[PDB]
Design a binder for this molecule. Structure first.
Ligand SMILES: [Zn+2]
Lengths: 129, 134, 52, 149
RNA sequence: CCCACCCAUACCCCGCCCUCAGGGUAGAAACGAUGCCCUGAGGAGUAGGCGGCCGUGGAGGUCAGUGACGAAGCCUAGGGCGUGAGCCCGGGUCGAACGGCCUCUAGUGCAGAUCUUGGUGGUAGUAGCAAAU
RNA sequence: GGGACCGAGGACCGCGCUCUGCAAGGAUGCUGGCGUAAUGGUCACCAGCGACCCGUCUUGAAACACGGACCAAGGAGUCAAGGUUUUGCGCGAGUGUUUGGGUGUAAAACCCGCACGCGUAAUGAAAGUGAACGUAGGUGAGAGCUUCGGCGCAUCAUCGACCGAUCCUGAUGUAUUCGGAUGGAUUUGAGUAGGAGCGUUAAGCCUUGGACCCGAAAGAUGGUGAACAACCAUCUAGUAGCUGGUUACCGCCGAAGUUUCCCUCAGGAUAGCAGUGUCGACCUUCAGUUUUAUGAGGUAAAGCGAAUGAACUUUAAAUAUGUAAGAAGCCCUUGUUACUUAACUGAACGUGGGCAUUCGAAUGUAUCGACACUAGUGGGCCAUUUUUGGUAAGCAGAACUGGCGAUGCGGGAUGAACCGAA
RNA sequence: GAGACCGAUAGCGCACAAGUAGAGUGAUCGAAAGAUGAAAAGCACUUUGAAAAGAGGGUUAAAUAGCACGUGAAAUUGUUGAAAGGGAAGCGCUUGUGACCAGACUUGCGCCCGGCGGAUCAUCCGGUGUUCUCACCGGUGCACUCCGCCGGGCUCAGGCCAG
């Protein structure tokens, strides 16, 4: 598009970073992440701890889970597995429960340094409506 | 937070801005190489900066801002005396502003050039005004 | 920045068609007909030509 | 204009007065042009008509933009996969109708010609066989090309 | 029937405005990446939809703003800017306060409403000296 | 060779050429003129050409009709409560301090103890019951990733699984009259199948209040006078229709005047036209077009030294006008069904193949489709052609197309319907 | 005691003689109207004449601030000046005539030589502040270097319009 709808100055910081990465890298991961940054808050539904566990429970373990949305906690998920999640935002319950399981929490700018081309990443988004 | 400062400076409020209707904006801050408010020449939004100033006694100095003396506003600027010979002062910019952005080097040389030119013009006006007696 | 007619300036003509030099040099636009005495039109073609 | 000549004049890329297109003669194309005879004039061009149309009013379709054929290079980057790498190749493909005429003619932007120097005939909107300008004039299109181009 | 000539905002070439579409731009740029550069196309417009911008009264911060050596206002067969709403300057008058920026706010923009209030015309030095004064 | 108009851009880069540099990705070189005025502004007037007075309202349109003596100031979509959509923001299975208390530099700011509102599991009229048999399932797509082997978001299609309720079948048993287990249904849910909400800000829309502003006759309460019932104040800014008016600029996108349904006429709900957001394909796909095949006209025509006789035909028009022209496709083999048939005879579900570097005409393609949401529209007049009826002649009615309606310009001396051209 | 209220056609009808003036038998209805100047210092006196008026003269910073009083718009009107006017004016494009008004590039740098004075010049000395290596004072002088200044000579550079 042309301008992000958000008034967050750090969300405009991330759009500036992923505009540069989408232009100067063949990886369609950067183009997809940049498209979802421009999208509104309703079009980025929250993703729960239970939903990122099912997409991990296959042979997709040891991959950096990337969710360009907020991460919410599920009280019905009794045990959290070890997992590295990069997201826009984390709730306090979610952040504590990844850290209790031995996992790590990343931001999208820490993702861009580590995996600029989006290598070995599991991209997820939440339920629409 | 150098970019976050710039976003606040550019798009919310800056006490040094002068908005003109002629398609250009001006910075009133005395430590700016050009009078214009842009990203390259805003000294507040650039942690590393250079500026050429002229003293009332007639001496031209070069000012240096580093990221380390940022939290200390009284010690923002290193003041270095520039040579009166025009070529040695241009070289003194190049050695001192080494490994800087080339915008700062190119505009400090322009600011040095205009300051010397005004000083020569200032002496020619004063000589003619003394002769004219008006 | 400026469209240039190959028919007006021959430098752009030589830029596009390098054969334009040898076309003018060997006078290919002034090629003459092959030699040979042209045989007369048949008399049968003439009486058809002015039948009525 | 009736609805059916309006559709034909759009399929022939004749969206403006004094617009020109190179068509190849089929039974499909001949029936289309015969319908729009009350608006167009057409004939059989010579080599000089084709050569001066491309050199003077030749323009291309590179990513949907009208860029003049000022260099041989822009021919190859858009038509070099068909064996057309020079501007003499485009002349040869249009004039002697070859296997890649479909791609060469559409690459060619429609020719924005001027009004003819000397004007048309006094009664312009009659048939050429009836003393006017509309319809098929065969080799007489070259006199119209020389006046307009 | 033939030759030439005349001119539409139409057609062709060139310049300029804006909009749209495509492209380029970071161990940063010699221009606010909400910036800059390159290329092409387009341009009537009612009901209606969307955006930007100008002007008004008051409010927070700012310009270490202007001001009795003259603020605001008004006038002006003067100098400029902007496509435009508008804006700046000169000359005169005048006497005490006012302006730009970024935000907040609203009792915020007029040619009409046989609009309201005030003031003033032609009719007209006419009708006619009735009433009122 | 002669003339006119133009000089955009601003280090190099490119293609070239006649290569000690050129006319090769946009004008340089030389000379002159310019301060008691080069060049402009405003006013008045003359001259050539142009040029109806604005707004409102009716209508297909003009024409009527209403308003305008002039100037200054005022002057008309506002504010509350409750819904609803979208954007931003905070926290997030939670959210909301501000009733109140504590506090204070005192109507500010700061802090919160208990409840409360909305949400976090559903269905059935009800008794009430109550979310796992399969990595919460299988298969196929699908963004993205990839050790190039394969993993596969959201979402959709299908086959399943469970639960609430309904219609069944009826286990150990049981107080001898109580129960629902197991096995089914072309069922229903605003169900489960792993939460998205709450508060707030901005804009818009809906409802009610005076409700964009101005504008009846009436009715009622309480008084004042006295007479052809009248006046006064209030309820009351009453209400119904129906008029009039409704305030700077520029830019972008831009209509409809219609099909169908329902019923008061005074109207809404769909679909279409304009737009916004999401998802998906790759610019795929589509198209008031041509061609090919084939209908509806064998319509004209050639022949009848072919037969037979528009109703004759070997052949076949023109010209409009329906239907198809692959991979989302074809054929048949083999199995089933709840449908059908004497019968895989048909329909559906599965099976197999070939061609993916001519995937099965031409031309064009300023993307297309699905879902959701949001404004304005739902009149006609004239002409061409075809056609039905009628008159002494006018004329009346259908169907298509075109023009004007929201459209300036050139021409026809002038002009709603003409010609050219937007 | 206060205000993101209104500022004299607004705000209560009333900033002031306001429920006043005035109307109606009566119940009731109900306005318009603020601003000299810092200070009246509110024009003494002379002189026309019958007046809410002038000419002199004075007060004042100012009287074109004179109780018609801060500022003083437009409509409308008089005088003076210019131009025009054969049954409409006004308006658009483009000249032309006259009148008045404005004033075009701010209009400069670089070399050479000679003198004079300064320093950021001397491995010169003393002092101060500091980001601790940069600045600023004071006193020395001119071997070198660099700035100015004065007197010559020289160079190019320029704004607009033409051919
Ligand atoms: Zn700045």
């Amino acid at each position: 598009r042309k301008a992000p709808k958000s008034d967050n100055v750090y969300l405009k910081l991330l759009v500036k970073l992923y505009r540069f990465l989408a232009r100067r890298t063949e990886a369609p991961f950067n183009k997809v992440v940049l498209r979802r940054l421009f999208m509104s808050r309703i079009n980025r539904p929250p993703v729960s701890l239970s939903r990122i566990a099912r997409n991990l429970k296959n042979g997709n373990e040891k991959k950096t889970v990337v969710v360009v949305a907020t991460v919410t906690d599920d009280n019905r998920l009794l045990q959290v597995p070890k997992m590295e999640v990069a997201a826009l935002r984390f709730t306090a319950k979610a952040r504590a429960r990844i850290e209790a399981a031995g996992g790590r929490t990343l931001t999208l700018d820490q993702l861009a340094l580590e995996k600029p081309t989006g290598a070995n990443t599991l991209l997820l988004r939440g339920p629409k409506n | 937070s150098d970019e976050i400062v710039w976003q606040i400076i550019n798009q919310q409020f800056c006490a040094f801005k002068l908005k003109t209707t002629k398609g250009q904006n001006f910075c009133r801050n005395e430590y700016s190489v050009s009078g214009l408010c842009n990203r390259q020449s805003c000294p507040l939004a650039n942690s590393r900066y250079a500026t050429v100033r002229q003293s009332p006694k007639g001496t031209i100095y070069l000012y240096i801002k580093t990221i380390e003396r940022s939290h200390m506003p009284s010690k923002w600027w290193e003041k270095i005396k520039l040579s009166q010979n025009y070529q040695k002062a241009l070289e003194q910019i190049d050695q001192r502003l080494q490994f800087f952005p080339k915008f700062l080097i190119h505009k400090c040389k322009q600011r040095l050039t205009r300051l010397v030119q005004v000083a020569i013009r200032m002496r020619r006006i004063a000589a003619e005004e003394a002769r004219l007696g008006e | 920045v400026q469209k240039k007619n190959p028919l007006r300036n021959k430098q752009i003509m030589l830029r596009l068609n390098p054969y334009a030099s040898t076309f003018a040099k060997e006078k290919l636009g002034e090629v003459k007909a092959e030699e040979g005495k042209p045989p007369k039109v048949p008399a049968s073609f003439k009486e058809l030509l002015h039948e009525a | 204009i009736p609805p059916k000549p309006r559709k034909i004049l759009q399929l022939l890329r004749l969206r403006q007065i004094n617009n020109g297109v190179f068509v190849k003669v089929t039974k499909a194309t001949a029936e289309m042009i015969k319908i729009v005879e009350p608006w167009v004039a057409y004939g059989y061009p010579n080599l000089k008509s084709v050569r001066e149309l491309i050199y003077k009013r030749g323009y291309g379709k590179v990513n949907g933009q009208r860029i003049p054929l000022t260099d041989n290079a822009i021919i190859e980057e858009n038509l070099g996969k068909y064996g057309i790498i020079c501007i003499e190749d485009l002349i040869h493909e249009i004039f002697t109708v070859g296997p890649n005429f479909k791609q060469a003619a559409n690459f060619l932007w429609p020719f924005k010609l001027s009004n003819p120097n000397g004007g048309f005939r006094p009664r312009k909107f009659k048939h050429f066989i009836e003393g006017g300008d509309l319809g098929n004039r065969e080799e007489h299109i070259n006199a119209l090309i020389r006046a307009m181009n």
